[PDB]
Amino acid sequence: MKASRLYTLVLVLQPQRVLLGMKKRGFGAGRWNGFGGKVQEGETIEDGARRELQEESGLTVDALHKVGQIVFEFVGEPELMDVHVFCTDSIQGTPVESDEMRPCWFQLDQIPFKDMWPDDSYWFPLLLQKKKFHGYFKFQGQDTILDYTLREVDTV
Ligand SMILES: Nc1nc2c([nH]c(=O)n2[C@H]2C[C@H](O)[C@@H](COP(=O)(O)OP(=O)(O)OP(=O)(O)O)O2)c(=O)[nH]1
Ligand SMILES: [Mn+2]
Ligand SMILES: [Mn+2]
Numbered sequence: 069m070k071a072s073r074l075y076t077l078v079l080v081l082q083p084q085r086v087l088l089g090m091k092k093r094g095f096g097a098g099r100w101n102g103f104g105g106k107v108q109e110g111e112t113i114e115d116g117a118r119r120e121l122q123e124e125s126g127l128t129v130d131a132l133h134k135v136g137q138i139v140f141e142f143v144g145e146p147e148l149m150d151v152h153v154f155c156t157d158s159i160q161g162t163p164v165e166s167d168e169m170r171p172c173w174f175q176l177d178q179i180p181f182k183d184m185w186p187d188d189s190y191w192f193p194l195l196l197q198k199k200k201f202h203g204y205f206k207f208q209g210q211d212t213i214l215d216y217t218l219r220e221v222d223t224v
């Protein structure tokens with residue numbers, strides 16, 4: 069049994085493009101990703117996701133929808149990362165670079181998988197198909213998956 073810490077991840081997914089951010093420092097630096105971070109005390113997971121989206125991309129959204137949950141384990145780290153994944157298609161301002169992230173739109177036939185976390189190759193296609201999912205990935209360092217599970221689910 070391991071303890072887990074709550075994180076969020078938000079994908080702004082439109083009909084033909086997705087907004088990603090290049091992580092400029094910290095965890096996962098150098099990889100394109102959705103926006104997110106730790107959930108803080110007192111806020112719902114969805115509201116923490118909205119907050120991180122605003123902080124890292126400048127975008128303010130009224131609502132998100134849950135699309136998946138992914139648990140990450142790292143060799144040498146006792147704490148699991150419990151990542152709650154959300155989407156929205158509906159925005160009304162422009163993305164702006166933050167200290168954490170440089171936002172960029174990608175067409176949906178140009179998803180930059182080689183410059184994303186390796187696990188994203190497995191679950192991101194489900195997100196694109198509008199399937200909901202649960203995943204688990206064990207990493208050695210940043211690059212190497214030692215074990216993983218991925219399951220489509222009816223409810224996140
Ligand atoms: N796509 C993808 N995202 C991941 C993976 N692992 C992982 O932690 N994430 C996400 C969850 C969070 O959005 C982010 C990690 O949190 P973070 O370090 O940005 O937290 P934060 O913004 O609060 O950190 P900080 O500003 O205090 O430095 O990366 C992964 O394998 N794939
Ligand atoms: Mn953040
Ligand atoms: Mn972050």
Ligand SMILES: [Mn+2]
Pocket residue numbers: 105106120
């Ligand atoms: Mn934060």
